[PDB]
Amino acid sequence: AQYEDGKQYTTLEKPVAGAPQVLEFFSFFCPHCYQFEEVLHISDNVKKKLPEGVKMTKYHVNFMGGDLGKDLTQAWAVAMALGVEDKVTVPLFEGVQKTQTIRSASDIRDVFINAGIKGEEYDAAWNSFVVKSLVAQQEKAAADVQLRGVPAMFVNGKYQLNPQGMDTSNMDVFVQQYADTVKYLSEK
């Protein structure tokens, strides 16, 4: 076949019922995740090829960067609750991996303040129980699928993208192959 289990995707022998349709995992400490966001715009190009009415979910993970890693998962929860993912994703990536000016919870907060979210609003979000269960959702989803690596995308809780098995000579061709794979998996 043109798409084969173990080539552009692997199959979870333990499928995850009730999973989000297109589920993506990342870490602000993850160097391929940086590329996926800044250079490749994976999430966006995937969306552009998905049938519409499909929900796209993206979660942060704890297993990179120790204490800060966890802070970042709570911060991403704050971003999702406030709907400000598109405003903080890039300065969080660059603050962690490019400029190294993110070293504490307080530096993460600065990014949100500079992106124009208000102090009182961030801190209430940060400390709110809605954020707590959003943190719980992120951990549970990662836990459900045996996650030890990022970036990672899962389709319908049964299929996992396999980017090592695609061409990387050309960045644009890579993305398009990636997105077409998701679209195929979507229709399966």
Side-chain angles (χ1 to χ4, degrees):
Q2 293 277 352
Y3 293 102
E4 298 171 17
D5 189 354
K7 181 191 170 177
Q8 298 105 323
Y9 69 90
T10 50
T11 311
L12 296 171
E13 257 231 349
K14 183 158 319 263
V16 176
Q21 294 155 263
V22 177
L23 177 58
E24 206 177 325
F25 291 100
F26 80 107
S27 163
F28 286 110
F29 281 86
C30 167
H32 279 124
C33 303
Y34 189 111
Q35 293 293 302
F36 266 38
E37 167 67 27
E38 307 262 288
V39 185
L40 300 178
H41 307 283
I42 294 286
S43 306
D44 213 86
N45 275 283
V46 168
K47 180 161 192 111
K48 276 175 17 74
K49 286 207 171 164
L50 287 180
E52 285 164 8
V54 145
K55 103 159 166 152
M56 205 138 174
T57 310
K58 172 137 75 183
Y59 292 156
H60 195 263
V61 299
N62 294 340
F63 62 77
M64 292 187 80
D67 222 303
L68 253 196
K70 283 205 75 162
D71 278 324
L72 284 165
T73 302
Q74 190 165 349
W76 186 247
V78 171
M80 293 188 283
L82 295 184
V84 289
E85 298 90 326
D86 292 358
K87 283 174 183 187
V88 294
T89 289
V90 163
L92 284 169
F93 264 113
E94 304 199 345
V96 175
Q97 294 187 52
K98 197 187 170 177
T99 56
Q100 282 182 0
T101 47
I102 293 177
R103 302 191 220 144
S104 67
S106 166
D107 298 340
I108 298 176
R109 183 177 186 273
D110 287 344
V111 172
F112 285 72
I113 302 290
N114 186 38
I117 295 83
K118 292 157 188 176
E120 277 173 0
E121 192 180 12
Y122 183 84
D123 302 341
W126 182 267
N127 285 309
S128 72
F129 288 81
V130 175
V131 152
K132 286 193 194 307
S133 57
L134 229 37
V135 165
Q137 287 171 236
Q138 297 183 86
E139 299 180 18
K140 183 191 183 281
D144 284 337
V145 297
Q146 320 338 125
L147 190 68
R148 100 172 83 104
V150 281
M153 186 182 283
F154 295 87
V155 179
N156 292 315
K158 223 186 163 341
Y159 306 113
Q160 176 180 4
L161 275 278
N162 186 45
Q164 308 116 341
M166 314 178 188
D167 176 324
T168 59
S169 55
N170 190 309
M171 316 195 86
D172 299 312
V173 173
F174 171 74
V175 179
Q176 292 306 26
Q177 177 171 10
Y178 199 101
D180 293 341
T181 303
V182 178
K183 172 176 195 288
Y184 158 81
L185 291 179
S186 176
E187 290 159 9
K188 228 186 157 74

